Design a protein around this ligand. Sequence first.
Ligand SMILES: Cc1cc2nc3c(=O)[nH]c(=O)nc-3n(C[C@H](O)[C@H](O)[C@H](O)COP(=O)(O)O)c2cc1C
Ligand SMILES: Cc1cc2nc3c(=O)[nH]c(=O)nc-3n(C[C@H](O)[C@H](O)[C@H](O)COP(=O)(O)O)c2cc1C
Ligand SMILES: O=C(O)c1[nH]c(=O)[nH]c(=O)c1CCc1cc(C(F)(F)F)cc(C(F)(F)F)c1
Ligand SMILES: O=C(O)c1[nH]c(=O)[nH]c(=O)c1CCc1cc(C(F)(F)F)cc(C(F)(F)F)c1
Lengths: 313, 313
Amino acid sequence: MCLKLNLLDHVFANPFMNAAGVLCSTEEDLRCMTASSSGALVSKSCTSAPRDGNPEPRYMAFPLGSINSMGLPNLGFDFYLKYASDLHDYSKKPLFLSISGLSVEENVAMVRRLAPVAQEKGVLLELNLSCPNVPGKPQVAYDFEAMRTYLQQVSLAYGLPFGVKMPPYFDIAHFDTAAAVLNEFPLVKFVTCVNSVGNGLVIDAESESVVIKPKQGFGGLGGKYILPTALANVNAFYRRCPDKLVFGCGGVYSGEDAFLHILAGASMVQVGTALQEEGPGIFTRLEDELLEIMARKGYRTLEEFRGRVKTIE
Amino acid sequence: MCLKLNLLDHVFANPFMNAAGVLCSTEEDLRCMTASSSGALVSKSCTSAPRDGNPEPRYMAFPLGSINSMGLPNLGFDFYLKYASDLHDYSKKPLFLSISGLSVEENVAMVRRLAPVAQEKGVLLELNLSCPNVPGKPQVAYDFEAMRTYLQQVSLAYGLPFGVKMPPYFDIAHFDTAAAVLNEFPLVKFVTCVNSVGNGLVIDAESESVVIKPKQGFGGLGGKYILPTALANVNAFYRRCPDKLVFGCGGVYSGEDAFLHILAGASMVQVGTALQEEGPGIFTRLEDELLEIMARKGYRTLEEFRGRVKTIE
Ligand SMILES: Cc1cc2nc3c(=O)[nH]c(=O)nc-3n(C[C@H](O)[C@H](O)[C@H](O)COP(=O)(O)O)c2cc1C
Ligand SMILES: Cc1cc2nc3c(=O)[nH]c(=O)nc-3n(C[C@H](O)[C@H](O)[C@H](O)COP(=O)(O)O)c2cc1C
Ligand SMILES: O=C(O)c1[nH]c(=O)[nH]c(=O)c1CCc1cc(C(F)(F)F)cc(C(F)(F)F)c1
Ligand SMILES: O=C(O)c1[nH]c(=O)[nH]c(=O)c1CCc1cc(C(F)(F)F)cc(C(F)(F)F)c1
């Protein structure tokens, strides 16, 4: 009985990793994830230039999850690249590196430089399609022509297998369109569903106040609020992209949530909010929990039940 | 201290009403809702001809909320028009009538016939914009050209004040676009935010099966999963549509949740999943809980805090 997986020409002890943004910003964070029993890790979505991000408070958590309008604080591409090329211990686990450029050109500039390191060290690219592009247009993955543009240019600039981080969709025609677009691009080998549930609003009753300062309180939603949404997207893309891997991300607190993500068709399982709340010891719990569920049902590998959610008639 | 208010030229004993779809399909249901403490009620969204809906199971509820893909079962517009026309006791409370036709023409044909009875009795139209039109194109409120067309044609055709039921949005540019559209129409006097969080997927771990039979298990989300989404929407529309009312719908299980909806800017507060689960007694508890929070804070009227949510700095 075991959690092991081989995919994208890498070997993974288990299907768990941090989500981009959580416990992956600094060198201290990355060594922490690396020393965790996570099966992998992903570095904070980066821009060309270092970024302070937005004013605090900017993340908050509650029993049902979290809200965030961080404003993409990061140490800049040169730092994550250097982590990839010189600091990371690949004998421990594989590394994903997440880029989240503010324009198609920023994204092109970075991936061009990422290419040789990817080839030689084996770091794996996650391109973030949630990014805003021009303010007043929707984020890139909610604008299918912009998303088309970004994948042609990045596919061209990088010329290696990469993956993509998708915002959730809520309409069947949107699942169909977005997946048709992704299926145009053979080098996109994996799809991560999902990024935050966009622009919710938490209000505190006692103070009669919103709880995060940027954007009049509006922010992305993670955690228990979003599991079903995350499972629907994982499964929508698992079904429409037969030649790609889907990575699940969305309200994982427990081996049981990891179990459903996988039945839905998840290969890797990312933890954002619950990892922020609990800390990296979460990964041993998630492993034993998923193993406990497997034993009870007589599954010995992940691939016995991956993608095998049943329907009614 | 009482929770009375006046709007759209009607008096309400309190801001509470059922959400469309819940306890409002048959004459039995509507009599029940009328005998309740709700300040108002709304009839099941209706089409010209009666409709069986989708195969069962089609609604499931769990501690954090609900998923549904009912398929718009209803007794057809002749029934609800006749309820509005001959059976409803307007001395008891105001009545809203939801219409949700499958095309603009079906919608035009229902509103013209409704108009006379609205004139005569004061039944209030809630036009449901979270309805698909065409298989393959997104639902109507996710297609701003179609949404403009329904608003144009219905406004022409009905020619009295009416309101619309919106699905949630998740992107700031879509709030701006959506609301710019609704502002084109002076007859739209209320906006109900929000309908279900579209196409989520609940999976059951023990049975490894989705839980509703239609749409491969995919369905609209309500309940605790959607409250911050409903709040962001109420507030986004409240701020962008100053000459309209906003009705809030989404995740109201308590007086507290109702209170956050009003601070977000809601005039009326609708209850779906929580009313499905607890029954119409829920209205007495919600009233008392809200009056209690008001008392403790020294609020005498809803007017005093409606739309008064604080931001930081
Ligand atoms: C504080 C915080 C920062 C995040 N930063 C990023 C980011 O930089 N890039 C990204 O693609 N996703 C980011 N996310 C989204 C997570 O990767 C994840 O998609 C989302 O939180 C849902 O997972 P959860 O439900 O486990 O929180 C962030 C989430 C949080 C809470
Ligand atoms: C069983 C069921 C049937 C519904 N039917 C309708 C409907 O016919 N028309 C409509 O506009 N909304 C319908 N809704 C949506 C609700 O009116 C409400 O927007 C949504 O459930 C979110 O509110 P809640 O969080 O209080 O459930 C339905 C919801 C449920 C759960
Ligand atoms: O840094 C973030 O706000 C963030 N938070 C998430 O939950 N997911 C993300 O992918 C990101 C970073 C991308 C991002 C998102 C946004 C948003 F406000 F549209 F959600 C803004 C920005 C930026 F660059 F503008 F600050 C970046
Ligand atoms: O009766 C519904 O399924 C329903 N459920 C909701 O949560 N909100 C609603 O507004 C409705 C009725 C409108 C509706 C929605 C859908 C859906 F699958 F796009 F959500 C389908 C249909 C229809 F007409 F196809 F049955 C109607």
